[model samples]
Target: NPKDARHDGWQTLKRFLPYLWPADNAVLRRRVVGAILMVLLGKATTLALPFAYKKAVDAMTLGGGAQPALTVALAFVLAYALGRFSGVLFDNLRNIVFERVGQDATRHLAENVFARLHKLSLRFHLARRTGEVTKVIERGTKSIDTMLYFLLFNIAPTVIELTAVIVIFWLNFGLGLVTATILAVIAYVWTTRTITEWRTHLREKMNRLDGQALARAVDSLLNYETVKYFGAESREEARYASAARAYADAAVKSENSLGLLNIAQALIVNLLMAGAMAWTVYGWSQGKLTVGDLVFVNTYLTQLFRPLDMLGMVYRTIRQGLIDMAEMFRLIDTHIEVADVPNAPALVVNRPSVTFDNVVFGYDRDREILHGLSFEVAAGSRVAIVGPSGAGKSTIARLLFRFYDPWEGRILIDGQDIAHVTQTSLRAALGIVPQDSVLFNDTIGYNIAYGRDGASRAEVDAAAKGAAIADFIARLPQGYDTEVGERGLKLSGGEKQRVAIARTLVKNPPILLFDEATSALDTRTEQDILSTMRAVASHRTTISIAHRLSTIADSDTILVLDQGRLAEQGSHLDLLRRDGLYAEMWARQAAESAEVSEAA
Candidate 1:
């Protein structure tokens, strides 16, 4: 199982490698190559700095006896300074050259994940929390740049420097010192890995807690009105505070573990440093090594330890990055419940007539909401579907939109099976105005224009006029430019429904669906919206799913549903004459309305 963790990290890196050297982009390929060269150049200059320091120290020691050696010592000192400067210069150049590569790779991955999230089934989206999904993407994309920088620039260069330092030690200080040096490095790395593995679990807990806190915050804020209406603000605050407190506790534990790892690393490094320096001093005292050799050993170890000190952080960062990227890759690997067939053709609409042939479906496999339901709406005709609660009215609209395919049978638009058509083309040919119209936080005109990509100003204005909201917008001081706050909370229920209608009108789809579009409004507002909806449906194939019978009574045809079956179908008067379910519902609603009128 532990090796499985290593295997997963390797697999993640394999998936991530393609972004580093983008095959299609020649310029990015060159940048990657250039960055590697800079790393090499930087390491060469850095390794040379110890040699320059050694020579300068030797010259200075000799200058104490010879005046001419003073000039040599000063020149070597200048060389050492220049070598240090060049090392930093190359490192900065590497970062500058690779910046674009990292940003482009991050963008591509983020875009791919965004598209994948959108393509995932309605079931997946409905089950997932928006806050957690967004957090995953944010952390995943941020990890990319840090991972790339540390893996390529820090880890790679440190390995190269370590190898070069070992070789230098063998040539200058003999096998005995070289053996000691290698053993110390191996011990240091082993200790770091062991402690870091222990801390990994702590970090994982912290990450989970962080996501939970964010999810709670987002869910509570999104339901702000509900909290206020029910006087549950204190309850919501307590819920969020509990999540945040849990995250803080985990974060503290994680940070404390980091301190332990740092302490162990420092102990190992200093032990090596002290032992090596003591040995060098003994060699110099014995007259077997010069004072310059002592300085050389010290300088080499100092330079080597600089990167060694960062090794712990580098390993931890790469490990955490792998974990984050793995989560994102899992999302990408999620099976799409509804995917287009290979080479699927676009849906071509001739008259936009819709037919549901014995459709059956449910959100869950064990429970069927729409059992053997069948219906049809002819082109350029208006039809209303009236049903009680749990009668599958909204399910029909979702099927038409192809959000979920039927469990059995086919849905057709103009005789073309919707399942066989490309989803983009299928959606582009139909539009809907749902019961709750949620708008983006933007201008009224912008929300209307969102119905169709790149819709013109004239088209948006025309849609507003068609939806009968143009006069209302004109009365506002800012007119169409007025901001509709989050979920269109700034507008009344009727106003939001009109905005929804205007948005759908701009799409200009052949088939239009109103899924209880005005059920939330007052009686007067509902009647007004009903008139507007009738005007908008005049030239399109319209299907209205309604709970209020009166609002849709004038529809050309009414299909009454009960327990997922069509209980009645006829004109309002025809259904009234039949004295079936429709008549019973009508009598009850009329009685209730008369009671309210008499009370007034």
Candidate 2:
């Protein structure tokens, strides 16, 4: 039934209607009214054409004299031609008036969804695929224009035309034809809607598989080197083809169902056409109905059934559109994991002291990773955290950044609880050169300048010099304007690290975070960056999470974490004297370094 389809579609569109026609905008209101007037005028001109055509035919049949009949025929022929032109002209004008409303609505809706996606937390992004999310947005945004056209031009005008047809039939023909026409229409809509609902399910399944297939292709291409190393080209192709095949099966079923619906609709409509025409023929033979009346009924039915024939496709499109809209709204309804408290104060980092007061956390609730871990770094001091794999060293950085909050205990900066302050303000005090150092596929200058928005070329150059990367950048053919391939793949690991360091230096935050920043660099590049970083960290509070013991050996404090607990904590020399976890780890790394040196 259209009632079911309307309920679902309108429910989805209700939230977005305000954007289409803002209640306070008189200009939009006027356009809306103008479109409706055009609809009526267009329908009137179109409906009048059938009567004119009937009169022209009737004039030919009743030939009292050639001159009189010829004049009558010409008059009605002119009226029919003018009616067709007026109908098309007004309909096109309605589209012109309503064009702005549809585009504005689509633009605003896309912008709103984009803004909402950003508002959501890192957790949501990590869990969702970029390909799939983009598909949902594309479908959702695209549906607005289609839905607007159908709702305005198709459904509303169709109802108006149907009502006019029924009223005309009741006045001219009789109750029998009117009842038969109404019954045929109801049956047609019911059959189309019932079959379309079933097809809708199959299409939804196909769409889901389509998104997955696209996502797989995107992810495989993005990790092309990984696939090459594993020699998994065949495997990746098979995986994508499996999804494609599944989608094909669903699509086939959906199309087959559509064919069935089309056959059923045609059967009912043709039967009604024959019945109405045959009934009029019998009445004409009985001298009750004119030949012109027969033509008029056939024309009116043809015009009435024009949109009715399209109603099946319209319902299908709208049904799928409603599904797309609901999916996007669900994304919008997602809860923000780390929203700021109401009236939250900005963080003040005068001392820039950092503290993890017996914090506890886990990415998953069932698997606790940080078990009451506590540590502190004094103002203007450097602290390095080292641990075995899966010991939660990286989790601490995430907690400090408030990407995920600690399940228990509070993290503080300058004696202020980070949770109590705005996340923007807290992050403003921090700068990080992460381990991977992924970059945008743009100029080296652009990536470096991203550290600080609106940084000048001179400032970026100064930062590059400070990070010891200026010489390398200047040697490139395009210098700072050199294009980096996808994810900075054109640059070597050490080169990417230097760019990351330069970017962080440009940011010049009060607190610096180095999450294994030198891990990817060679011995010589590591030493070079270490010296530059030491100079930069001299005046600021710093936190370094490292696997390489040499990088943090001169820090004011060294913390050793083992299985989410603080295994040891003190200065490097102080911890070495004890010959505990820190000493054991240091000895192992030192041996590896000597082995590497010997091989070199």
TM for every model, in the order presented, reads: 0.87, 0.84
lDDT of candidate 1 over 375-484, digit per residue (tens): 78888888999978877887888888888998998899999999999999999998899988877778988999999999999999899998888998999988878888
Shift in Å, residue 60, candidate 1: 3.9
Give me the runs in candidate 2 sitting further than 4 Å from their true place.
Answer: 1-8, 24-27, 57-73, 125-148, 194-261, 285-288, 475-479, 487-489, 594-600
lDDT of 1: 0.85
- lDDT accuracy of residue 481 in candidate 1: 82
Alpha-carbon shift of residue 381 in model 2 (angstroms) = 1.7
Shift in Å, residue 429, candidate 2: 1.1
lDDT of 1 at 146: 75
Assess each prediction's global lDDT (C-alpha) against the native: 0.85, 0.85
C-alpha lDDT (0 to 100) for residue 251 of candidate 2? 79
